């Protein structure tokens, strides 16, 4: 597991082509996230 | 040391994460291939995750974090999807949850984008798809995906070209 960026404790991955893309987020240390909520879902076969 | 709480649809906290996921189903660049082909969920259940031991040690990063960026831990709410989940809500995030060959290092990944995390639920690429029909698009077999409290601080910019 590499470190984070010196003076910096994530990265903030932000697409630039795809404008309806939304940020993807990076951590090097397991105790920075929380596992609140478990959800269960089936994905949806469109009409 | 994890109990899980069963919400009711009928609570606002139910109808808020469902509302997070449902709202942030995009259009993939590979046409569904490694998610399936879909434009909402049927939400099944959604259980809260009590572990005051794996709280306690996430608080604690916090205020470390918080404290070295000035009074700003920096925190979101984010997906998770992983073959690995029931490890980490029984035993916490560590390396072996990294994605090792990630666009952005080797850590551990987090998204806005609900099916962003939907494509890795069943693996990298989604893997060979549900363990029981081998499908990327099944209907039928039960996902799971975590939304999870991540603390950022100081966070590296980084632009992609996706
Ligand atoms: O090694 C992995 N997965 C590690 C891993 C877990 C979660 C993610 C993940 N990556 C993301 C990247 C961008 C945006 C969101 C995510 C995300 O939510 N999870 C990536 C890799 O799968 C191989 C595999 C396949 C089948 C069985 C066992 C293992
Ligand atoms: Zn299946």
């Known amino acids: 597991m590499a470190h984070s960026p010196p003076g910096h404790h994530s990265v903030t991955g932000r697409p630039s082509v795809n404008g309806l893309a939304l940020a993807e987020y990076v951590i090097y240390r397991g105790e920075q996230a929380y ?8 994905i949806m ?3 | 040391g994890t109990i899980l709480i069963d919400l009711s649809p009928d609570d606002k906290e ?3 994460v469902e509302e997070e996921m449902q709202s942030t189903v995009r259009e993939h660049r590979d046409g569904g291939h490694a998610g399936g082909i879909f434009n909402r969920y049927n939400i099944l259940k959604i259980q809260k995750v ?4 794996l709280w306690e040690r996430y608080t604690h990063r916090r205020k470390e974090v918080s404290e070295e960026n000035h009074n700003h831990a920096n925190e979101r709410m984010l997906f998770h999807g ?3 989940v029931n490890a980490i809500i029984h035993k916490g995030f560590d390396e072996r949850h990294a994605y090792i060959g990630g666009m952005f290092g080797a850590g551990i990944y987090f998204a806005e984008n609900s099916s962003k995390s939907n494509q890795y639920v069943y693996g990298i690429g989604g893997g060979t798809g549900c363990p029981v029909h081998k499908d990327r698009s099944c209907y039928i077999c039960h996902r799971q995906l975590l939304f999870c409290r991540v603390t950022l601080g100081k966070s590296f910019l980084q632009f992609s070209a996706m």
């Not at chain 1, 596992?35 to 089936?42: D, H, R, V």
């Not at chain 2, 009590?50 to 031991?53: E, P, Q, V």
Request: hydrophobic share 20%; proline share 14%; net charge positive.
């Open chain 1, 35 to 42: 596992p609140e909520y478990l959800i269960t879902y089936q």
């Open chain 1, 45 to 47: 076969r469109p009409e």
């Open chain 2, 14 to 16: 139910f109808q808020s």
């Open chain 2, 50 to 53: 009590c572990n005051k031991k």
């Open chain 2, 82 to 84: 992983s073959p690995f």
